[PDB]
Every structure is written in structure tokens, then in C-alpha cells.
């Protein structure tokens, strides 16, 4: 729809004047129905006309219309439909809701966003339909089963959350009754999905809640499919819960030990995979509950060969670090020949299992470095360092981890001399994997073992890998920076060779090459100050000062980052591009609509305001404080956090008298993410300089007849109190009649802001003797507890939790008194929640503050221990 071609008339109608060219709609304003979606919403094209023809299915028609409006309608319409379906889920019932939701999600012409919205509606309709979806457990499970095996991680996480919510709502017996015929099914994918759902239900409802059911399913001898499904469910429960199966490791190992002795090789492979998953969890301590599993497994590595032998070798490599030193030495002394014999295996899964077991076979004592370099490392370099291994990510990352383990075990130089030859290849993925392995070897071990005969070859290979890059990945730049950090002072005969290739990369037809050269200059900027190279940095800064005119904003942001790195690595007042001819040069650069370029410009402006504030005539900073108000309202959450620090630095430099009026004039914009970002900047300016100079002016902005300006001033006062803390004892009497008048307003947002300011004043002035103003503010914050808005209720709860620590738990128990036994339950629940919060805040303090209760006829409640006196 968004990529459809448009005619000249539609293009001309969407442009204003002054520019030179160089029935099929259901019942009104319902959204557009697809031609393949005319089956679930077929009852909406005809009119309702509800008069002597309206059964209980007429509410299901409205629920289907709401689902059609939430599926393909407007996002405000989708939010209104979700608010109408969430608040009325109990009245509509789970029956027709499930009967309308289940064929809609099972359509073969669905999409990712519609399935995500259906899963969100099923998750939001599961909290009000608790203990009511037990007949609809299997119908929801048959739709949630392929969601866990999907490609996207977010859809799998949503399916796991929906399965956990269904296990928490339907209990344990209903899921065990529903998942019982789904174990012996003919479909293997449905059996694997049922095993994954059973593992998710066991993770969400506890391991001993489903342990005897899994033990009865695993020990039953009727077919190999039920035992294979039980072993797969045990392996999935071991792989899902990392450290949660450690108290229940023996009860799972005793059930897993019954397998791998049957006539079926698939059940033995599943039992070996479950043992490897259980040993994976108990990677350092699995031997304790594994002595009955080491005897049939190792003979399986001796008596047979194939996929089961590879699974047994993976289980042995997972159980070998979890044993003693002599046991691991005896295991590695008899499995190295089986690993060397499996180096020529044509199978990819056996090669991946061998590469995973080779990382764990050499990680401790017992394996010598000479034998590993003689008989283990040449076949690993000849059989695994190929071009097909770099294609798959799971075959590249495991190979890189095995190479890092071999470099940490044997040595970094012996791996570097064998991996430096692949840095100048013709493949991008193999060169990127070799650069990542070299960066990991330089970060873990270092560059001390590399002599002078290999460092120049490695630098040439890194330069050939960086100069011949076709993708936008940052692996090569990070590897070059890691090599330059590991080299240190050994790169002194390399700076005319590298930087001369950098400036030659600065003039090219492409746009990503200049950005890559600027990123490489920014990553190698810290290696120039430590090698006594100051003329080259001064030449590069003067070169990059004229490189701010690149039309690509992605290259301009990298050039700004390189200039910031050069200004950080060198002195602020000792730069050949000085601050007198750079801070006016960055003033039109700050008006860029990009995210990273404006973030780098704001960081450079904050650094120039913090370290070089004496380089301006105090007039350009006032003109940049008005451009700092347009630096907010950006969806990046980084430039808005640096603009407040830059405004605070400008207020500290030029005085807190001109930026405060600019911050108060920008408080009335009526836009989100622009008045809170100015209130935080005003609070940072009041916290950097003296806050008393910002005390009457913040008292003046509440005098203007505006709700947004008063809310921004109250938010700025609350943020200034939270930033001050213990310095708020002198500014409490000036803010007490403001907070006493803001709490009596009709607007609930001003009352919530006053409650937040009272919470900040109670949390900042605790232990200073300011319990008189806090008790006055609590008398106004106490009628605000009966609000219906969750934000105002959360602000009142935070104010109560801040005032209970300041004024004492006795005053909070006195204010919460005579409300726990209240007749009205709406006040009684809030009083019980406040009493529970006061008990969780200070439980020992409520003993002396407890009221006196008289004794009853049958029971006694008078404390005779504290009533006695000596």
C-alpha cells in the first residue's frame, strides 16, 4: 500500500501552492476489509437492526467488530477497541471470545503485526478470564504451539509469556490433562511443540509439580514416541531453566538414566541430549549427580559411531568440566583420539559438536600445550578453517570461541601466525571472522607474544581488511582499535603508513568510506598520545576541521566523533584547531535533524562549555542556549540528556540569569518531551550554581495563569529537590506555601506534582529536624489518597513512602489509624495497602507505635509485658 505507484494528480494535490516543478464497507466508518478476510467479519456487512432479533451472539458480533477495528484499523481505534475488550472481558465471556479469536489466528493469509496484536489481545484477555479458560486450554495451546518455534525472538518470548500465563491461570491439573493426548501424536513437530509447552508449564509452575507426571511419562513402556517426547521435554526444561533445576538435578538424572539403553537410537540420542543439557546447567558441578551416567555413555562412544556417538561425545564434553581434576584428565586422555578421528566427518552437526567439545576439552590442567600444538591444532586448522563455516552464524561463533579457547590454552602467537594469512582473502565473512578472532586474542591474551616478524604482517592484514570492507559492520574498526590498544608503543613505525591511508580514504566517490575512515581515526586517537605523537594529531585535527562540510550526515557525525576524540585525547586549549574558531563553526552544525550528528554536536558543545568556556565573548553562548531548546523532542534519549548538562554548564559559565528566562519562556509549548526536558535543565542549572538565585523566579512561574507552566515549574522544583537532597533544608520554608497551594488545586496533575515534590523534600531532608513542614504537607497529601487515577495514586503512595521515613512510622500509623476497620471497602483497601507499605518500610518501629487494644471475652489482646513497670 505504501509502495504503490501514484499518478500525477495525486502527487499534485498533496503539494501546496508556490512550488515549481523541476455494499463493500461495513456499516459506516469501519476500516478496510481484506478480500481474504471476508469470512470472520461476514456478519458485519449487513446491518444489525437489533429489535426482536438479538441473541447472546449479538454481543459476539460487537466483539468481532472490535477485533476487526483493532486488527486493521487506526492505532487510536485499536487502543479504544483494546480498552473496550479488556474492561468487558468478564461480561463478554471467554467462550465466544475464544470462538472468534481461534479461527482468526489460524488463517493462512495472516501477517506478523496481526498475529502480534492477536497475541497481545490474548495476553490482555487472560488476566480477567482467570479460572475460566480451562475448556479452552487446548484451543489456545494449538495456536500458541508454533509461536515458540518461530524465527523471531520477540514472537517466541510472547508465546512463552502466553504459555506461562495460561499455566498460571489454568493451574497444574488442567494442563496435564490437556497435554496428555498430545504426547503420542503422529506429528513430530506437534510433539516437539507439546514438549516445549510442557517444559514452559513446568518452568512456570515449578519442577516438583510436574516431576511425578514426567516420571510416569518417561518410565512408561508402550512406544518410543512418548519416551522421546518426555526426554525432549526434560531437555527443554533443562535448557530453559539455567540454575533452577540444580535442587531437582538428582530427580531428573534418575529419570534420564533409564534411557539410552533401549533399542531405539532416537531415544538414546534424546537421552544423551538431555544429559548434556543437565550437565550444561551443572557445568562445574554435575558429576555429583552423574556417576550412574558416565558408565553407559562412554561405552556408547566406544561401541558405536554416528549421531549417537556425537551426542555422547557432546555429553562427555559437557560433563568433563563438572568433575574432579583426575577424572577430567582421565576423560580427556581417552577422548582426544576420538576427537581427532572425527575431524574428517562430512556431517555438519558432528563437526559442530566436535568444535563445541574441543573448547571444553582444553580449558584446565591435564592437556599439555605441546601435544595440543602438535596433534590437535594442525587438524583443527586444516579441517575446520574453511569457507563454508563462516556462512552460518552458529558455525562461525562456535569456531571463534574454540579458536579463542585454543589461543588462551596453547598461545596467542601460535594462533596469530596461522590466522594472519586469512586476513587478506577474497571473502568478507571469513575475513570478518578472522578479524574478530584476532580482536578476541588481543583482548584476552594480548600482543606481548607477537614478535616483530608478525606485527607488521598483522597490521597489513588489518589495513587490507579495513580498506576492502563492503558492509557497514563495526567489527573491523573495533578489531583495529583493539590491535592499536594491544600494540601500545609498538605501532610507532606505523602512523605514517596508517594515517596516510586514512586521508587518502577521506577523498573518495563513496560516502561510507569517509565515515569508515573517520571512525578508524576516532578509534585510533587514544594510541597517538601515548606514543609521543602530537604533530600528527595536530595535523589530523586541522584536516578534520575542514572535513565538516561532507554532504553525508553519517560521515559528518563520524567526523564530529573523531574531533571529539581528538579534543579528549589532547588538551582543550592546546589544539591547532582552537576553540575560538571551532565553537562558532559548530553553531550551524547543531541545527541538524539527524540523531547521531546532533548528539555528537551536543556532546562537543557540552565539552566546550565545561572545559573551554573562557574562549567565547559571552554572547554566542546566549545564542546557543536558544538553539538548545530545539535540541530536545528527539526520539533518541541521549541528546536530551546532554542538552540539560550543556545548559547547566552555560548557566555556570555566563551566570544563572539569562538561561533561566529562556528555560521559563520555553515552558509553555504544550508538547510532550519538551517541558520536562526544560524543567530538568532548570533543575540542573539550579543544582550547578546556587539554587537561591533560582528560588524567586521559580516562584514567579507559578504566578502565571497557565496549567502547563505551573506543572513545569512544579516538576522543576521536584527535580531540583531530588538533585539537591540534603541541601533542601534551607529551601523548604520557601516551597512550603507553594506546595500547600498546589495541593488544593482542582487539577490532579498539579496535585501529583506537589506530592512528588513533597516526596523529594521528605527524602532529601530526612534526619534534619524538618518534621514540622512535612506534617503540614501530609495533612494535604492525605485527602489525595482517594483518587482514581493510577498516576496520582502512585504519586500519593510515593509521597507516603517518603514521608514515613522522614516524619516517622508513628505519624504514618496514626494517619492510617481508624481506616483499616472502615465500612467502605474502597477506603479500607487503600488503608490496608498503606498499612502494608508502612509495615514493609519499618516493621520493628510499629511495636512502640501500636495503639492500646482492650481484651475481649474469649481472647486477650492487652500487652502485659510492656504495661509493667519496675
Amino acid at each position: 500500500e505504501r509502495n504503490r505507484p501514484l499518478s500525477d494528480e495525486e502527487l499534485d494535490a498533496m503539494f501546496p501552492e508556490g512550488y515549481k516543478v523541476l455494499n463493500d464497507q461495513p456499516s459506516g466508518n469501519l476500516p478496510f476489509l481484506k478480500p481474504d478476510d471476508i469470512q470472520y467479519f461476514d456478519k458485519l456487512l449487513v446491518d444489525v437492526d437489533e429489535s426482536t432479533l438479538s441473541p447472546e451472539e449479538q454481543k459476539e458480533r460487537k466483539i468481532m467488530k472490535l477485533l476487526l477495528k483493532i486488527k486493521n484499523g487506526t492505532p487510536p481505534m485499536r487502543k479504544a477497541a483494546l480498552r473496550q475488550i479488556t474492561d468487558k472481558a468478564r461480561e463478554f465471556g471467554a467462550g465466544p471470545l475464544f470462538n472468534q479469536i481461534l479461527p482468526l489466528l489460524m488463517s493462512p493469509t495472516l501477517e506478523d503485526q496481526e498475529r502480534h496484536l492477536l497475541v497481545k489481545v490474548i495476553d490482555r484477555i487472560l488476566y480477567k478470564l482467570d479460572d475460566l479458560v480451562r475448556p479452552y486450554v487446548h484451543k489456545i495451546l494449538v495456536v500458541i504451539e508454533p509461536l515458540l518455534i518461530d524465527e523471531d525472538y520477540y514472537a517466541r518470548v510472547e508465546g512463552r509469556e502466553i504459555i506461562s500465563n495460561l499455566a498460571k491461570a489454568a493451574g497444574l491439573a488442567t494442563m496435564i490433562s490437556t497435554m496428555r493426548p498430545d504426547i503420542d501424536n503422529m506429528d513430530e513437530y506437534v510433539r516437539n511443540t507439546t514438549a516445549r509447552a510442557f517444559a514452559v508449564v513446568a518452568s512456570a509452575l515449578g519442577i516438583p509439580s510436574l516431576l511425578p507426571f514426567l516420571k510416569a511419562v518417561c518410565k512408561s513402556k508402550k512406544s518410543w514416541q512418548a519416551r522421546h517426547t518426555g526426554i525432549k521435554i526434560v531437555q527443554q526444561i533443562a535448557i530453559l531453566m539455567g540454575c533452577a533445576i540444580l535442587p531437582h538435578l538428582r530427580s531428573l538424572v534418575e529419570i534420564i538414566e533409564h534411557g539410552l539403553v533401549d533399542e531405539q537410537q532416537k531415544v538414546r540420542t534424546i537421552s544423551a541430549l538431555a544429559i548434556a543439557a543437565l550437565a550444561e546447567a551443572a557445568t562445574p558441578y554435575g558429576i555429583e549427580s552423574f556417576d550412574s551416567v558416565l558408565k553407559p555413555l562412554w561405552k556408547g562412544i566406544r561401541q558405536h559411531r554416528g549421531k549417537g556417538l556425537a551426542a555422547f561425545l557432546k555429553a562427555i564434553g559437557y560433563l568433563i568440566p563438572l568433575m574432579d581434576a583426575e577424572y577430567a584428565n582421565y576423560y580427556t586422555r581417552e577422548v582426544m583420539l576420538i576427537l581427532i578421528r572425527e575431524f574428517q566427518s562430512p556431517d555438519e552437526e558432528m563437526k559442530k559438536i566436535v568444535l563445541k567439545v574441543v573448547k571444553q576439552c582444553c580449558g584446565t590442567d591435564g592437556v599439555e600445550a605441546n601435544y595440543i600444538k602438535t596433534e590437535i591444532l594442525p587438524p583443527f586448522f586444516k579441517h575446520f578453517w574453511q569457507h563454508r563455516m563462516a556462512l552460518d552464524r552458529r558455525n562461525y561463533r562456535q569456531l571463534v570461541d574454540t579458536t579463542v579457547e585454543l589461543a588462551n590454552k596453547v598461545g596467542a602467537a601460535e594462533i596469530i601466525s596461522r590466522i594472519v594469512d586469512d586476513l587478506k582473502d577474497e571473502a568478507e565473512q571469513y575475513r570478518k571472522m578472522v578479524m574478530e578472532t584476532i580482536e578476541k586474542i588481543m583482548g584476552n591474551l594480548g600482543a606481548a607474544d607477537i614478535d616483530h616478524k608478525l606485527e607488521e604482517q598483522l597490521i597489513d592484514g588489518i589495513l587490507y581488511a579495513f580498506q576492502e570492507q563492503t558492509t557497514e559492520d563495526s567489527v573491523m574498526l573495533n578489531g583495529f582499535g583493539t590491535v592499536v590498544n594491544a600494540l601500545g608503543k609498538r605501532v610507532k613505525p606505523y602512523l605514517p603508513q596508517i594515517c596516510g591511508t586514512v586521508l587518502w580514504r577521506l577523498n573518495n566517490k563513496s560516502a561510507k568510506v569517509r565515515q569508515q575512515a573517520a571512525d578508524l581515526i576516532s578509534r585510533t586517537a587514544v594510541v597517538m598520545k601515548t606514543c609521543q605523537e602530537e604533530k600528527l594529531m595536530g595535523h589530523l585535527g586541522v584536516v578534520l576541521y575542514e572535513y565538516l562540510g561532507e554532504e553525508y550526515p553519517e560521515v559528518l557525525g563520524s567526523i564530529l566523533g573523531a574531533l571529539k576524540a581528538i579534543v579528549n585525547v589532547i588538551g582543550m586549549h592546546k589544539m591547532t584547531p582552537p576553540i575560538k574558531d571551532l565553537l562558532p563553526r559548530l553553531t550551524p552544525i547543531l541545527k541538524n535533524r539527524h540523531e547521531k550528528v546532533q548528539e555528537n554536536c551536543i556532546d562537543l558543545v557540552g565539552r566546550i562549555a565545561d572545559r573551554g568556556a573562557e574562549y567565547v565573548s559571552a554572547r554566542e553562548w546566549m545564542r546557543i542556549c536558544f538553539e538548545l531548546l530545539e535540541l530536545l523532542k528527539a526520539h533518541k534519549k541521549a541528546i536530551r540528556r546532554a542538552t540539560v548538562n550543556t545548559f547547566g554548564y552555560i548557566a555556570k559559565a555566563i551566570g544563572p540569569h539569562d538561561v533561566l528566562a529562556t528555560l521559563l519562556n520555553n515552558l509553555k509549548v504544550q508538547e510532550r518531551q519538551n517541558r520536562v526536558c526544560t524543567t530538568v535543565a532548570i533543575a540542573i542549572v539550579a543544582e550547578t550554581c546556587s539554587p537561591f538565585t533560582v528560588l524567586p523566579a521559580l516562584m514567579n512561574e507559578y504566578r502565571v495563569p497557565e496549567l502547563n507552566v505551573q506543572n513545569g515549574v512544579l516538576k522543576s522544583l521536584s527535580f531540583l529537590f531530588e538533585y539537591i537532597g540534603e541541601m533542601g533544608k534551607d529551601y523548604i520554608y520557601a516551597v512550603t506555601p507553594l506546595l500547600e497551594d498546589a495541593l488544593m488545586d482542582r487539577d490532579l496533575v498539579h496535585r501529583q506534582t506537589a506530592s512528588a515534590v513533597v516526596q523529594h523534600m521528605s527524602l532529601g531532608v530526612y534526619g534534619f529536624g524538618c518534621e514540622d513542614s512535612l506534617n503540614h504537607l501530609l495533612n494535604y497529601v492525605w485527602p489525595n489518597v482517594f483518587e482514581t487515577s493510577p498516576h496520582v495514586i502512585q504519586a500519593v503512595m510515593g509521597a507516603l513512602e517518603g514521608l514515613r521515613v522522614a516524619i516517622g512510622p508513628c505519624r504514618m500509623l496514626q494517619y492510617c489509624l481508624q481506616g483499616l476497620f472502615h465500612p467502605a471497602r474502597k477506603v479500607r483497601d487503600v488503608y490496608w495497602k498503606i498499612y502494608n507499605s508502612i509495615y514493609i518500610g519499618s516493621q520493628d518501629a510499629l511495636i512502640a507505635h501500636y495503639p492500646r487494644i482492650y481484651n475481649d471475652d474469649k481472647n486477650t489482646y492487652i500487652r502485659y509485658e510492656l504495661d509493667y513497670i519496675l
Binding site: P705, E706, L707, N708, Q710, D745, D747
Partner: protein
Amino acid sequence: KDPYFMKNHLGSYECKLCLTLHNNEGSYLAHTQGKKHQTNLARR
């Protein structure tokens, strides 16, 4: 010249005859015509 529309202390509009609140200036001019304002003018 409407003697019922007033300005509050928060930058809003207030109808004193029907005692109603309005956020923008376009909601006070649309609240004069309606079932409640006509009934309040006929009763007073």
C-alpha cells in the same frame, strides 16, 4: 457578549451557568450551542 464565559487560573475557559470546563478556545464557542446550555439559558 456572553456573561457566563470566564477565565480560570490555569488558562482554561469556564461556563458559570452550566458550570463546565473547556481546555481550548474552540471548545467554549462550541459549548454555547447544545442541549445543556439552551436548557440553562431557558431556566435562568
